[PDB]
Enzyme design. Structure first.
Site, PDB file in Angstrom:
ATOM      1  N   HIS A  42      31.711  39.827  52.785  1.00 41.05           N
ATOM      2  CA  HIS A  42      31.691  38.430  53.208  1.00 41.05           C
ATOM      3  C   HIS A  42      32.896  38.026  54.063  1.00 41.05           C
ATOM      4  O   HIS A  42      32.899  36.958  54.669  1.00 41.05           O
ATOM      5  CB  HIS A  42      31.536  37.502  51.983  1.00 41.05           C
ATOM      6  N   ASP A  88      28.686  42.297  47.663  1.00 43.10           N
ATOM      7  CA  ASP A  88      29.869  41.908  48.434  1.00 43.10           C
ATOM      8  C   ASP A  88      30.870  43.060  48.518  1.00 43.10           C
ATOM      9  O   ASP A  88      31.859  43.095  47.789  1.00 43.10           O
ATOM     10  CB  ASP A  88      30.535  40.699  47.775  1.00 43.10           C
ATOM     11  N   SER A 185      40.426  36.961  48.767  1.00 41.23           N
ATOM     12  CA  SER A 185      39.116  37.603  48.879  1.00 41.23           C
ATOM     13  C   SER A 185      39.150  38.943  49.597  1.00 41.23           C
ATOM     14  O   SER A 185      39.853  39.101  50.590  1.00 41.23           O
ATOM     15  CB  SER A 185      38.138  36.667  49.589  1.00 41.23           C
ATOM     16  N   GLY A 186      38.365  39.899  49.102  1.00 38.39           N
ATOM     17  CA  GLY A 186      38.333  41.218  49.703  1.00 38.39           C
ATOM     18  C   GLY A 186      39.469  42.030  49.118  1.00 38.39           C
ATOM     19  O   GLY A 186      39.480  43.256  49.197  1.00 38.39           O
TER      20      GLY A 186
HETATM   21  O1  LIG Z   1      35.310  27.298  45.663  1.00 34.26           O
HETATM   22  C1  LIG Z   1      34.724  28.171  46.293  1.00 34.26           C
HETATM   23  C2  LIG Z   1      33.241  28.455  46.261  1.00 34.26           C
HETATM   24  N1  LIG Z   1      32.443  27.244  46.400  1.00 34.26           N
HETATM   25  S1  LIG Z   1      31.324  26.892  45.262  1.00 34.26           S
HETATM   26  O2  LIG Z   1      32.060  26.823  44.029  1.00 34.26           O
HETATM   27  O3  LIG Z   1      30.770  25.709  45.843  1.00 34.26           O
HETATM   28  C3  LIG Z   1      30.222  28.212  45.205  1.00 34.26           C
HETATM   29  C4  LIG Z   1      28.957  28.154  45.852  1.00 34.26           C
HETATM   30  C5  LIG Z   1      28.346  29.428  45.658  1.00 34.26           C
HETATM   31  N2  LIG Z   1      27.080  29.746  46.160  1.00 34.26           N
HETATM   32  C6  LIG Z   1      26.543  30.990  45.933  1.00 34.26           C
HETATM   33  C7  LIG Z   1      27.244  31.991  45.184  1.00 34.26           C
HETATM   34  C8  LIG Z   1      28.544  31.662  44.675  1.00 34.26           C
HETATM   35  C9  LIG Z   1      29.076  30.368  44.926  1.00 34.26           C
HETATM   36  S2  LIG Z   1      30.552  29.716  44.459  1.00 34.26           S
HETATM   37  C10 LIG Z   1      32.987  29.344  47.481  1.00 34.26           C
HETATM   38  C11 LIG Z   1      34.323  29.996  47.737  1.00 34.26           C
HETATM   39  N3  LIG Z   1      35.282  29.074  47.134  1.00 34.26           N
HETATM   40  C12 LIG Z   1      36.703  29.202  47.461  1.00 34.26           C
HETATM   41  C13 LIG Z   1      37.224  30.386  46.672  1.00 34.26           C
HETATM   42  C14 LIG Z   1      37.445  31.696  47.142  1.00 34.26           C
HETATM   43  C15 LIG Z   1      37.911  32.414  46.029  1.00 34.26           C
HETATM   44  C16 LIG Z   1      38.305  33.774  45.858  1.00 34.26           C
HETATM   45  C17 LIG Z   1      38.735  34.173  44.557  1.00 34.26           C
HETATM   46  N4  LIG Z   1      38.762  33.268  43.529  1.00 34.26           N
HETATM   47  C18 LIG Z   1      38.400  31.965  43.637  1.00 34.26           C
HETATM   48  C19 LIG Z   1      37.956  31.488  44.906  1.00 34.26           C
HETATM   49  N5  LIG Z   1      37.524  30.263  45.366  1.00 34.26           N
END
Ligand SMILES: O=C1[C@@H](NS(=O)(=O)c2cc3ncccc3s2)CCN1Cc1cc2ccncc2[nH]1
Ligand SMILES: [Ca+2]
Lengths: 234, 51
Positions: A42, A88, A185-186
């Site tokens: 991703h 992923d 991430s990654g």
């Molecule tokens: O808050 C967030 C997430 N938004 S959501 O909760 O609306 C999600 C919507 C969603 N839709 C499909 C699958 C998983 C998710 S999670 C997306 C990335 N991010 C930021 C984010 C990146 C990251 C990496 C590691 N740990 C926590 C992290 N939060």
């Protein structure tokens, strides 16, 4: 990384950073070997053109061990699905080999069965990166590392608002303000066994960062070991 | 067997023919005692760097 500590000299040598055209890091990576970087599929959507920097610990002071590497091949999983974060995983072959030195060394690839029974049943794993230190904060200037306990699959499946496929697992805390975050991430999730670190996951996603009742979701590396081996030969 | 202290292996443990067999990650060589893993060269995988 929210909370945790910064990696001290030579503590997270396998950490790699994917940097965009403006040299800002946007995702992490794990050094698998002199030619391969393990990242999140991703992230390949995060930027058009990018490179991989290794041996970096303070993006605000060229300490010497840093090395930027151009990407030759981008091997994304054929089954990766954007809408759900499933599958992923991506592997990157670099044009030039990484020269191992202080703060530049690979993480060991474990064997599936042994990793799942022995590594993933350990109390904790280690996640690291240059990602945000707060849910709505700025990316971190210093490489950080956080010990994240493995979370029971069911307590985790229950906590999540989205489907936890068989290709992902949970780690982190329920309420404790400690957790990976955007920008990490990654990045690597490694489990230490007898002073040798094995890659056990790829920072994938999470609902926000360090939120209560929510955990950190990683790509289950053990489920793609055969895939990684084949990608590191093509 | 491998469920008992990892079978005394440094790394990978597999139970073959009702016995324990140890192995190591790429870049390591199984010691003569068939349990310990010796690094093949400098900067072996999974090791934090000290010099
Ligand atoms: O808050 C967030 C997430 N938004 S959501 O909760 O609306 C999600 C919507 C969603 N839709 C499909 C699958 C998983 C998710 S999670 C997306 C990335 N991010 C930021 C984010 C990146 C990251 C990496 C590691 N740990 C926590 C992290 N939060
Ligand atoms: Ca630096």
């Amino acid at each position: 990384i929210v909370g945790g500590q910064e990696c001290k000299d030579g503590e997270c040598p396998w950490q790699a950073l994917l940097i965009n055209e403006e040299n800002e890091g946007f995702c992490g990576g794990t050094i698998l070997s002199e030619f391969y970087i393990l990242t999140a599929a991703h992230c390949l959507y995060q930027a058009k053109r990018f490179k991989v920097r290794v041996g970096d610990r303070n993006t605000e002071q060229e300490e010497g061990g840093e090395a930027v590497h151009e990407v030759e091949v981008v091997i994304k999983h054929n089954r990766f699905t954007k809408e759900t974060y499933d599958f992923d995983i991506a592997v990157l072959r670099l044009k030039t080999p990484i020269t191992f030195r202080m703060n530049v060394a690979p993480a060991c690839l474990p064997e599936r069965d042994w990793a799942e029974s022995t590594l993933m049943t350990q109390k904790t794993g280690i996640v690291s990166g240059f990602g945000r230190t707060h849910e709505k904060g700025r990316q971190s200037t210093r490489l950080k590392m956080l010990e994240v306990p493995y979370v029971d699959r069911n307590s985790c499946k229950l906590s999540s608002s989205f489907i936890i496929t068989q290709n992902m697992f949970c780690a982190g805390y329920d309420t404790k303000q400690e957790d990976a975050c955007q920008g990490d991430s990654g990045g690597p999730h490694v489990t230490r066994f007898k002073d040798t670190y094995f890659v056990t996951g790829i920072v994938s996603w999470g609902e926000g960062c360090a939120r209560k009742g929510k955990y950190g979701i990683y790509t289950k590396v053990t489920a793609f070991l055969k895939w990684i081996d084949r990608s590191m030969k093509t | 067997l491998c469920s008992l202290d990892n079978g005394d292996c440094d790394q990978f443990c597999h139970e073959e023919q009702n016995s324990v067999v140890c192995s190591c990650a790429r870049g390591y060589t199984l010691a003569d005692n068939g349990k310990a893993c010796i690094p093949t060269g400098p900067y072996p995988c999974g090791k934090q760097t000290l010099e």
